[PDB]
């Protein structure tokens, strides 16, 4: 596994309470040898005025997953910061929960590149994103 | 003036009530000849686990200002959809409110490219992003 | 089989003569069921002042493969234009030839998203890129 | 004045001789208080098969100015390496020369973010990009 920190999903979700992650009910549901998955509802706090999932919400999910995964790949006082993020909106979502799957593209000593694919309840690709991080010690 | 539709800040803000923008208390506060600005609180709703402004929060603001601006540059039954969004997080925020300034880079018949710069309350650049949109019907 | 145009590697390379692709000796070497590959030398026309591959050349390579791949997925009068491109430089190359491997992330009737990976002669990842295109008639 | 190293345009241009920038006739022509500008011809060397400026070419120009500008804001044996590049292609060039204007968005101790806008001979925006760099010392 690419993970360096031994932390459970329970702890992960716990850490989101009190901040944006908990506010949007973004929940981590699976972690594999090299993948991290989280879900996010398509509701009043994530929808645009016309009932569609707000594209901004999809990036929050993507950046949220990518940054914790990167963090999980560092040690102790090391921290991870999002330097650059981009995403392609290819499919709209209107209900249920969307699912983001995060996988590494590059894992370095000072930088990481994560790819996050988010799908609707029927498994269709709604958003594809890439996050670039910096590993820092302050 | 780049706008093709008429609208009030009051109307704009009213449309976010009950959905994402409204629950994040993102408010449109200025509409110029070719610029649109909105602010967003820096708090529990928009912070990441370690107390700083969530990078996704910044993208939410950018996509919100950029998409509405895009819409106001279309006519009739025409609509705007976000295709691609990219952003460079240059500085973090810890409190108060940040403000996004949105100006056009390209206003085509089928596509638009919008630049949204977000600043902290001291005027320092925190995020630089670009939203590419498509103009569609139906 | 994602292509809608039947054109050989010979013809693709032929089309590159007289323009940038030919100038840099970018050569397509493989067309798969859903992948396109081309190599580019690391020499005087693609190196920075210190013998390393110019990060710009890797992007030229990426956009070239992605745009032709996108083009190959359209038909007749339709053309493909690059709207957004992003690339992460993870390792620089010093010699021989590098190889770009392009695969689709999304193929729509109006837009496409391609991911291009560039490796050195040793198979190590040097540049990872993403190209967003628009399908136009004009 | 953001500059930390002393240089002349004559020196800058001389360094591209024999390598990529030199063969593309990219020429640095202005150094401002916090800006760097260079032009590049729209010809056989920088065109794609259908006669228009190669989007990859605009990235080459962007990364060239951005990387040197970054190096000019460092000292001693410090050096600059490009981390991530992203660009929005908004207009296609057919002839003459395009010119890129590079300005800083962030000048940190370990990272830099540069904005490069490329215009055609009529002053119209053709490409807007951002280069993120890492300051290294070895």
UniProtKB/Swiss-Prot annotation, chains A, B, C, D:
Pathway: Quinol/quinone metabolism; 1,4-dihydroxy-2-naphthoate biosynthesis; 1,4-dihydroxy-2-naphthoate from chorismate: step 7/7; Quinol/quinone metabolism; menaquinone biosynthesis. Signal peptide: none annotated. InterPro entries: HotDog_dom_sf (IPR029069), MenI (IPR030863), PAAI_dom (IPR003736), Thioestr_dom (IPR006683). GO terms for cellular component: cytosol. Keywords: Hydrolase, Menaquinone biosynthesis. The active site is at residue 63. SUPFAM superfamilies: Thioesterase/thiol ester dehydrase-isomerase. Its EC number is 3.1.2.28. It catalyses: 1,4-dihydroxy-2-naphthoyl-CoA + H2O = 1,4-dihydroxy-2-naphthoate + CoA + H(+). It comes from the Bacteria. Changing residue 54 to F: Almost loss of activity with benzoyl-CoA as substrate. GO terms for biological process: menaquinone biosynthetic process. It is an enzyme of class 3 (hydrolase). It holds the Pfam family 4HBT. Coiled coil: none annotated. Catalyzes the hydrolysis of 1,4-dihydroxy-2-naphthoyl-CoA (DHNA-CoA) to 1,4-dihydroxy-2-naphthoate (DHNA). Also shows significant activity toward a wide range of acyl-CoA thioesters, and minimal activity toward benzoyl-holoEntB. This is 1,4-dihydroxy-2-naphthoyl-CoA hydrolase. It comes from Escherichia coli (strain K12).
């Amino acid at each position: 596994m690419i993970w360096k920190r031994k932390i459970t999903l329970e702890a992960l979700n716990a850490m989101g309470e009190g901040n944006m992650v908990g506010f949007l009910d973004i929940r981590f549901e699976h972690i594999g040898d090299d993948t991290l998955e989280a879900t996010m509802p398509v509701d009043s706090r994530t929808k645009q005025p016309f009932g569609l999932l707000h594209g901004g919400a999809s990036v929050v999910l993507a950046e949220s997953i990518g940054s914790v995964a990167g963090y999980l790949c560092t040690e102790g006082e090391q921290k991870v910061v999002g330097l650059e993020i981009n995403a392609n909106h290819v499919r709209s979502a209107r209900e249920g929960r969307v699912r983001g799957v995060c996988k590494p593209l590059h894992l370095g000593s000072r930088h990481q590149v994560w790819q996050i694919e988010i799908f609707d309840e029927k498994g269709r690709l709604c958003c594809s994103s890439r996050l670039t991080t910096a590993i820092l010690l302050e």
